[PDB]
C-alpha cells in the first residue's frame, strides 16, 4: 500500500529561449514518458534516485544536505516543501521515495525531455499530496517553480509548468526578478497566496494534426549554446529585440489556431517561429539547428506538415506536425532513415495514484 | 537629535575574477570617500538618495517598493532590515534617512568604488543601530550580502565586506550556492547564526609602500567584460582553472607580505596578478587593461613598484604601491601627463555617530 | 544692500501635454534669460511688475488683493508665502519688490519661457529667503507649486519645477487629483510636510550634442489648444491614450539616453515625440506644430540632429539638438533664414545674491 | 434610534451652461426622488453607498481615503465635514452611514437628477444634525460646494444648492475665481465666516403651471459636453459672448415671470432658453437638443407650452411647462410613444429625522 506519482517529462512546441523574458509566452506539451516517484510510509526518511545504488537519508521534520551532485534538485524540492508544510503547522512523518525515469536514454543521455523539472514536480506533488492534498495546483506550482529556479540560476520555469499540469500548454513567464528579490524578505506562505506578476499558465487542447517527436540525440551542452545566446542579448539589443518582438506576434497566432483549431495557422505559424530561430542563431554565430535536426525539420515541411527543433538546440528531440496519420508514418521511416531516433507521442499526463 | 553614518567606497587591490568563484580570496582597501546616511525620527517614513529631490515613502513596517531602477539596492536593504528586525520582535518606527555621496566624479559618472555595495551597507547599519544596535558586524555583513547579492543578481560580496569592515581586507568568497539553495528554506534569522562555509574575512594592518589610486579618464563598459569572462570560463576551463590556481598562491603571498611589512614580496605579487590578468584577458579575447591602464600598472611598474587595473577592468581604477612618497609623487606627475586623473588616497574607516 | 532673486525662463524638451497626467513624466531645461526680483525694507509694501506703471500695496502680514489681471501669479505667490509664515510663528515687515523680465521679445510678447512659473518661483524665493532661508528646497517647490496650480487652473507644474532647480531635469507630475481634493480639507503646513505622491525632479546632465531654441514664435491664445487638447481626450479616448502609451516609451527611452549619454539614442527618441505630437495635434484638430515650427524641426533634422516644438506649440519656441557646434551654426544660419529667431543657449541656474 | 436624511435630486430649469460663469444666474426645481442616507452610532466608521457591495472604514477623526473611484465625491464630503468639525472643537465619534438611491431607472442608469451633489449633501446633513445641529444652511452650503467643486474639477454648484435647499430655487454663481485661489491659503473656518462674492440662493414659488419631467433614457457623459463648451468658449468669445450675455436677459425675464405669476412669460422665456442652447450646440458642435429633446420640447411647444432639456443635454432629462393638466397629460402620452420615460413630479423637500 503506497503512494505513487507519475510526471510527464516536456517538450518545448514554440516560442523557446524568448520565454526566459518576462511575461513572454511558450507552447509546451507533456509527453508519454514519465518519472515514477514511489512514496510510503517509513522507520526513517529514505530518497532513492536513478543515479546513485544507495539511498540518502536525513531527520524528520529536518534538512536533507547530501555531499553528492545529483541531490541538488531533488533535495531543495524536499528542503522547501518541509519549510512550508512546518510553516503551516502540518507535521512531517517519515517516508520512503523512491524515483524511476524513462527520460534516458538506454546510451544514459537525457531526450531532453526536462529531467531536472520533472524530478522537482514530482517530490512536490509527492510531499503534498501525502501532507497537504487539499493544496492548489497553483500553489504546487508555484513550490515546484521557485524550488527548480533556485537551484538552475536561471530559466523560464516552463518545462516546471508542462510537468506539472500535463497536456498541452501556453506558458507565460512570471516576473522572476520579483520573485528574486522578495526570496529575501518574504515567506513562502506568501509566495503562495500573493499573485505572481505575469504569470499565465493555459491549458491548451490537443491539436488534430499528427504529433511526431524525433531525438537527434546530440548531447547538448547546454551551459554553453544558451549562455551564448545569454551573452548575445546584452551585446546586439536590436536583433534581440526583433527576435522578441516577432516570437510574440507568432506566439498569438499559434495560439489563435490553438483556439480556433485553425489547422494551416499552425503549420505557418510553426514554420515562422522555426526561422527567427535560425535568424537568432545565424546573427550570433550560434547553431540551434543542427544538421540532423535541419534535416528533421525539412522532411517535415516536404511531408506537408511543419517541423523544428525542440528546446535550446544542438541536438536532443525535433517536433513536427503532420496533415495525416499515414504522412506520419512516412515521416518517421523518412527520420529513422536519416539517423533521427523516432519516439511514439502521447501527450503526457500527471497520474497520482495510491493502489 | 540624528544619526550620522559614513561607509567608504572599495577597491579591489588583487583577486578580481576568481574571487567570484566561493572560496576563493581577494584584497581590498576602503577608501576615504564616502556615502553619508543621516538617519533621523520623522512622521512618515522618508527616503532620499542623491538625483532625486523627491523623497519615497512607504507603509510604517511595510514594503517599500518603488518603480525606480535607481532604489533598487536601497530598497532590498530596507526590506531584508525590515523582515529581519520583524523576526526580532522589534517594531519598527518611521524614519527619515538621506543618502549622500563623494563616490561619483564631476560629471556624474561613478569612479567604480562600489556605490551600490556602499549604499547597502550604509542602510543595513543605520537600521541596525537604530533598531538593534548590539548585533555583530559579522551578522550585519551577512544581512548586506544577502541583500546586494539577489539584486545584483551575482558577485562575490567582497565589495559589501569591504565598505562594512573599512581598512584593509583579505576576503575569501562563502559558498554563494549553499546560500542561495537556502534563501528558499531558510530564514533570515537561521543564516545570521549559521556559519557560512568557507567564509572568510580577515583584517590586514596598513600597508608601509605608498598606495596610489587613478582613474582612467572613463567609465568601463562592463556589460561586455564581466559576461566575456563569465562565458570564457564555461567554454575553456583549463585555463581558467590554471588562473584560479594562480590566484590563490598570490594571494597567499600578499598577505604574507603585508603580516611579514615585505614590500618586495608585494611589488612582485602586485605583478604576478597583473599578469595573470592579462592572461586571462587575452585567452578570452577581451581586454581587462585599457590602454590607459596599461600606461598606469607600466609606469608604476617603471617607477620601481607595483600597479594594476582594480576591480573589472575596461576602465575606472588602476592602483598602485611604490617604495617612497617622493617615488609616489613622481608616479602621480606622470599617470597626470598621460591622461590619468589621481585620486588622493588614505585607508577609508565606517564612522557611526549619534550627534 | 537689498536682496536680488534671478529665476532662470524653461523650456519643455520632452513629454508635452502627456506630462498634464498624474505621474507622467517631462524633460525640461532652464534658460539663461531671467526674471529678476529685487526685494528690499521699506515703509510700505510695494510689488512692481513689468505690466503694470504704477505699483500694488498691502497691509503687512495681510493678503495682496488687487484688481488687476496681472497680478494674480505674483498675488497668489504673495498670499501663499504669507500665510506659510505666519504658520512657522514668522512675523513679516513691509518690503519692497521690483520685477524684471527677459522672457519678452522686443514687441512685448513672451517668448513662451514659463513666465508665469518663473514670477511665481521668483516670489516664493525672494520672501523665503529673507523671512525663513532654513526652508527646503522641495517645500519652496512645493509652494510655488500650490500657487501656480490654483491661478493656472491646469498644468502639470513641469514649469514650477525647472525655474526652481534650473539646469535640466526629468519631471514627474504628482498626483493632481491628490492634491486638488486635499486643498479643501487640508493646511498648508499639511501639504509641506506630507510626502506627495508620484512626484519627482530627478537632476539630469546637459547632454553633449549642441542645443539651440528658435523663437518660431507669436503669440497665439495657448488656452485655445490646452482646452482643445483637454476636450479631445475626452472626444477621443483611444486616440489620446495611443498618444500617452508611446510617450512614455519614448520618455523612458530619453531617460535611457541621458543616463547612457547615448546621443543617437537621444536623437531618435526626440523625433518620436515630434512624430506623436504632430499625430496628436492631426487628430485633435489641433495646431501644435505650426508651419514656421514644422520647418524648425525639419532643418534640425536635414542636418542630421533633431528638432521639435516646445510646450504648448502652436508659437512659442522650437528646440533643436546638432551633432556639432558647426551643424548647429548652420541650422541657426538657416532658421535665420526661414524667419525663425535665434536664442543663444546656457542652461539657466538660480541665482540669489545680496550683493 | 437612527437618523434618516433624505436629499432631493435636482433639475436645471433655465440659465445651464452660462450658470457656470461668476455671478450669473440659474433657476433649479428639487423633484421628488431621494437619496436616503441613514445614520447610527457604531464601534467603528462605516460608509456604504450604491456603487459598492461592501463599506470602507476609516479611523475615528480621522480621514477617510479608499481606493475605489466611485467614494470620491462622499470621502471628500466626509473629509471637510471633519476638517470643519474639528476647527469647532468637536469630538468625532464612529458612525454607520448607509446611501440608497431612487434617482436611477429600474435598468440601472443615472437619471440625471444630480447623484453626486445629493450624495454630498446628504452626507454633510447628516454629519452636520448629528454633531452640530446650530450651523447654517449657507454654511453647509459652502461645505457641500467646497467638496464638490474640488472632485468634480468644474460646475457652478447650483446643484449642490438645489438638493440643499429642496423647492424651487433661482441660483446665483459665487466667485469662482475668488473661492479658487484662497483653497491655497485659506483655512476652511475662514472660508465659513467669510461671505463669499455674488453668492445668492433665493426661494422661489412654484409656478402655477403643470411642471412635465421625461426621461429621455440616453445617459450623458457630461465632461466631453462642458469640456467641448469651454473650449468653444476660448474659440470663439464673441459667440459664447452672445450667448451669457442672451442668457442674462432671458434670466432676468424668468426671474420676473416667478415673481409675479406671469405666465405667459414663462412659456416664452423657456422658448428663448432652448433657442440660444440650441445656438450654441449648433455652434460649438454641442449636440445639446439632441433629436429626442428636440421632439421632447418640440411637443411641449406644440401642446401649447414650453420644453427643454434640463442640464447639459445630450440625454438625460427634458422638462415642460402646461397649461393644464389635461394638456399635459396629452403632452406626456406624446412622449411615451417616442420612448421618453415620465417620471411623476412634485417639488422635492429635504427630510431630516431622528426618529
Known amino acids: 500500500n503506497k503512494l505513487q506519482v507519475k510526471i510527464p517529462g516536456k517538450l518545448y512546441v514554440a516560442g523557446e529561449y524568448a520565454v526566459v523574458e518576462s ?23 529514505e530518497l532513492w534516485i536513478p543515479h546513485y545504488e544507495n539511498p540518502v537519508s536525513w531527520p524528520i521534520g529536518g534538512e536533507l544536505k547530501p555531499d553528492g551532485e545529483h541531490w541538488t534538485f531533488t533535495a531543495e524540492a524536499i528542503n522547501i516543501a518541509t519549510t512550508f508544510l512546518k510553516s503551516e503547522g502540518i507535521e512531517l512523518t517519515p517516508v520512503k521515495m523512491v524515483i524511476e525515469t524513462e ?59 508542462s510537468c506539472m499540469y500535463g497536456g498541452w500548454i501556453a506558458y507565460t513567464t512570471f516576473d522572476q526578478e520579483w520573485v528574486k528579490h522578495r526570496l529575501a524578505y518574504k515567506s513562502l506562505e506568501w509566495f503562495m497566496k500573493e499573485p505572481w506578476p505575469m504569470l499565465q499558465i493555459e491549458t491548451l487542447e490537443e491539436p488534430v494534426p499528427t504529433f511526431s517527436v524525433g531525438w537527434t540525440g546530440t548531447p547538448v551542452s547546454t551551459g554553453k549554446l544558451v549562455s551564448q545566446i545569454h551573452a548575445f542579448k ?13 516570437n ?5 497566432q499559434i495560439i489563435q489556431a490553438f483556439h480556433t483549431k485553425d489547422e494551416e495557422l499552425l503549420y ?15 546573427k550570433a554565430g550560434v547553431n540551434i539547428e543542427t544538421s540532423l535536426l535541419k534535416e528533421l525539420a525539412d522532411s517535415a515541411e516536404n511531408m506537408g506538415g511543419a517541423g523544428k527543433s525542440s528546446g535550446s538546440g544542438g ?13 506520419a508514418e512516412k515521416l518517421v521511416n523518412e527520420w529513422e532513415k536519416l539517423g533521427i531516433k523516432h519516439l511514439p507521442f502521447h501527450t503526457g499526463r500527471v497520474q497520482i495514484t495510491e493502489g
Do not use: W
Open 23 to 45: 511575461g513572454h509566452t511558450a507552447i509546451l506539451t507533456a509527453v508519454n514518458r514519465y518519472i515514477t516517484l514511489t512514496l510510503e510510509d517509513s522507520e526513517r526518511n
Open 234 to 246: 546584452q551585446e546586439d539589443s536590436k536583433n534581440y529585440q526583433h527576435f522578441l518582438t516577432r
Open 268 to 282: 505557418s505559424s510553426i514554420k515562422e517561429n522555426r526561422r527567427i530561430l535560425q535568424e537568432l542563431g545565424t
Open 103 to 161: 527520460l534516458i536514454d538506454q546510451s544514459g543521455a537525457k531526450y531532453g525531455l526536462g529531467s531536472s523539472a520533472a524530478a522537482t514536480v514530482a517530490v512536490i506533488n509527492a510531499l503534498m499530496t501525502k501532507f497537504y492534498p487539499e493544496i492548489s495546483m497553483l500553489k504546487k506550482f508555484k513550490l515546484a517553480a521557485l524550488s527548480h529556479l533556485v537551484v538552475q540560476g536561471n530559466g523560464s520555469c516552463g518545462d516546471i509548468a
Open 248 to 252: 510574440n506576434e507568432i506566439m498569438k
Open 315 to 327: 541536438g536532443d528531440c525535433g517536433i513536427a506536425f503532420s496533415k495525416t496519420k499515414e504522412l
